[PDB]
Design an enzyme around this catalytic site. Structure first.
Site, short mmCIF file in Angstrom:
data_model
loop_
_atom_site.label_atom_id
_atom_site.label_comp_id
_atom_site.label_asym_id
_atom_site.label_seq_id
_atom_site.Cartn_x
_atom_site.Cartn_y
_atom_site.Cartn_z
CE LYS A 115 4.07 4.51 0.14
NZ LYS A 115 3.23 4.60 1.52
CG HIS A 173 -0.70 2.06 7.42
ND1 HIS A 173 -0.09 1.72 8.31
CD2 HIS A 173 0.07 2.80 6.60
CE1 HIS A 173 1.07 1.90 8.38
NE2 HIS A 173 1.34 2.75 7.13
#
Ligand code: CL
Ligand code: CL
Ligand code: NA
Ligand code: NA
Lengths: 424, 424
Positions: A195, A322
């Site tokens: 991330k 996701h």
């Protein structure tokens, strides 16, 4: 036992829960100390109960209650009708709504987000009453286990004024590599995602290259949640040629993504500019993305995720998955879905390592060598632990958090903070 | 009864059958005096048998035998795996193959045509073992009955040297209107389709206008199977503005269709230039068609037809259904599929009125006011009548016909006949 060969919904119990989450950083803020979910227990006149799991923002809980009321008296096999009743009850669909998703993802269908947990619970009941695992309702498993990725985050050591977690801080390449080692030793993940959108691109590229050095055979992905301009994205992509399996949402919007993809040597993936069926035609016409990340929580449940998969296959798009902070009901549903999807070959994202609480009885969803075996039992394959559910519900009542708000929480710590983007 | 909670295929019996068909005319020839189908009886270790129905051309029968051998030992719930095994057994997919379809439609997937009847038979077994109608395996019915159209054809009075049928010849507008009255009195169809490409466009327009005069409230469709150039098509469309619900395959190929659609005031439909998933992206990019006709027999069974429906909904295409000469197994499958498809709102085509024989026991598929009620029983809802099956198999052996061949049959009557097109 089933009069008129009918098994229909008598009611739903929706239970909001909260579980501990570390101070994970992203481009719009930092995770709150508790993540919120709503557990759906869908009750039928056969006395069988189905499970679903979704977000728990205030307005979503109200919508879930309206949906539950609208579908009493409907067969659990009539999921087409159930979606339409939910659409009617909500007064039709809508966009620009970011609830449950921290304003990060704001274009998903409201009807699909509300329908999803009820649809998953319906399939769970279908499986229980037929003696079939949910994967058998989706065309049957094509693989016996589903591979997941290690989902790495830059993070503080602790939430302000709280005990540090066992992970420690990760604020540079060494810290990210250390976090990967700890996570991969424990879970066995074979693919790794970072991330990004938190530090300057060249520093995130440095973490990526350090990961490549430490884990030569692991596929790598980077996701800065649209923190970059298209020009910056193209530099990152060029610099990471041959290193990334794909690059997710480097820049905001379908046009910018298309600009980046024209130059990027690796495929672009998204869960931001394609999050609803009505966005697919523009994404396809513009060549904005090469990989779509499925997510049954906002695409409208498992059958609609199977539809997304078939559309991707037809139009030449890759398919991944996701995730958001989630518990064992979502995990079971994700595993049955991925097991039954021929073209879902990328490892799925999960936030699993970041939590240590759950609402289902243990034993059905073990990670081994980075993968979860698809349950072979009837239904979803997990069951509520009522004591655990009550404990996490009590935690929700006490923690005071009512909406996911990464930005608002960062601002409570650092008043002048803005969720700007792009940032580089 | 089900050891290891497993129900798997032990074998398949494939029975070719033939049933009487009148001398119906089309742009490439005339129907043979018997139409051919293959009945699949799919046997399992639970002693439950599933039914499917498909074409019966020589090469297709061989493929069906190879498929049957490849899938022994597979769960009837594992339809994803079953398709892949069939693909492997056939040595992968392929195009330019027109078997079962009289060279009229030559771009459909071979794997999908072979998989289809086995997939339908698998769903039939799934329904039987779970006690659910097949529509409950496709998201559940959204309507209790499925409307069909009156499928009108120009026709000779009789096959050469045979007794005339009870329809009489239809070779002009009066004859077509008379045929419509007879068919609609008997079946109650609320929509009407004319098979054109046989007489000059202005004469087929005249039949269309006569139909409109006789049946003011009936939606009308015209389908000349690509017998026209794009320039001729645009004149027909302009001349029938406000009369047709849609115009099917006026001209050959995606480019020509796109040219016509740019000027045509009614939507264009197809079952010729979009007959396989890999044709959808080009059709969408070119705006070649506005309506796609589903057909589970060549799109790969019922779940893949549901996928087609979702793709059409997503990309803004209307959805109807195409048919070929067929019996009661196909009819049941068509009805369950259409019942469960929210966006299949056009009346479905059927050749039903043109046959008077069947292989299933009667009573489950009555037409009333133009529609067939979806069966509520477990499985497909129809069962083989072994005496009827044996009789139609004996008819197939004796009639000598081994491939559908409208053109070859016309040439046996009229040696110099060519299947030219376009013709106008
Ligand atoms: Cl119902
Ligand atoms: Cl199997
Ligand atoms: Na992402
Ligand atoms: Na047609």
């Amino acid at each position: 036992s089933m009069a008129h060969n009918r098994i229909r919904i008598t009611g739903a119990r929706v239970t909001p829960v909260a579980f501990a989450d570390p101070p994970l950083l992203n481009t719009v803020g930092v995770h709150q100390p508790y993540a919120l979910r709503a557990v759906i227990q869908l009750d039928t006149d056969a006395g069988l109960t189905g499970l679903g799991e979704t977000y728990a923002d205030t307005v979503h809980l109200e919508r879930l209650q309206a949906a539950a009321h609208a579908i009493v008296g409907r067969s659990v096999f009539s999921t087409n009708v159930i979606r339409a009743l939910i659409s009617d009850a909500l007064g039709g669909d809508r966009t620009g709504d970011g609830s449950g998703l921290a304003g990060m993802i704001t274009s998903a269908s409201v009807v699909d987000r509300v329908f999803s947990p009820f649809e998953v619970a319906c399939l769970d009941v279908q499986g229980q009453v037929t003696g079939r695992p949910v994967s058998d309702l989706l065309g049957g498993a094509v693989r016996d286990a589903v591979p997941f990725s290690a989902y790495l985050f830059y993070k503080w050591a602790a939430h302000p004024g709280a005990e540090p977690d066992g992970w420690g801080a990760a604020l540079d390449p060494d810290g990210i590599v250390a976090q990967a080692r700890r996570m991969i030793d424990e879970y066995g993940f074979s693919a790794i995602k970072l991330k990004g959108g938190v530090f300057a691109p060249e520093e995130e590229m440095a973490a990526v290259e350090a990961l490549r050095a430490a884990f030569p055979d692991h596929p790598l992905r980077l996701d800065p949640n649209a923190a970059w301009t298209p020009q910056t994205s193209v530099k990152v992509a060029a610099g990471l040629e041959g290193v990334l399996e794909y690059l997710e949402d480097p820049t905001p919007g379908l046009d910018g993504m298309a600009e980046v993809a024209a130059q990027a040597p690796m495929p672009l993936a998204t869960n931001m500019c394609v999050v609803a069926f009505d966005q697919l035609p523009a994404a396809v016409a513009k060549n904005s993305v090469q990989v779509v990340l499925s997510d049954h929580h906002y695409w409208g449940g498992l059958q609609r995720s199977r539809l997304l998969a078939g559309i991707c296959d037809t139009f030449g798009l890759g398919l991944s998955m996701h995730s958001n902070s989630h518990l064992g009901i979502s995990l079971a549903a994700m595993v049955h879905l991925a097991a039954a999807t021929p073209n879902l070959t990328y490892a799925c994202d999960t936030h699993w390592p970041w939590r240590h609480e759950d609402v289902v009885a243990p034993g059905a969803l073990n990670f081994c060598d980075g993968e979860v075996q698809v349950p072979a039992t009837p239904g979803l394959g997990v069951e509520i632990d009522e004591d655990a559910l009550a404990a996490l519900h009590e935690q929700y009542l006490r923690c005071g958090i009512r909406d996911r708000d990464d930005t608002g929480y960062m601002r409570s710590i650092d008043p002048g903070f803005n969720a700007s983007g792009p940032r580089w």
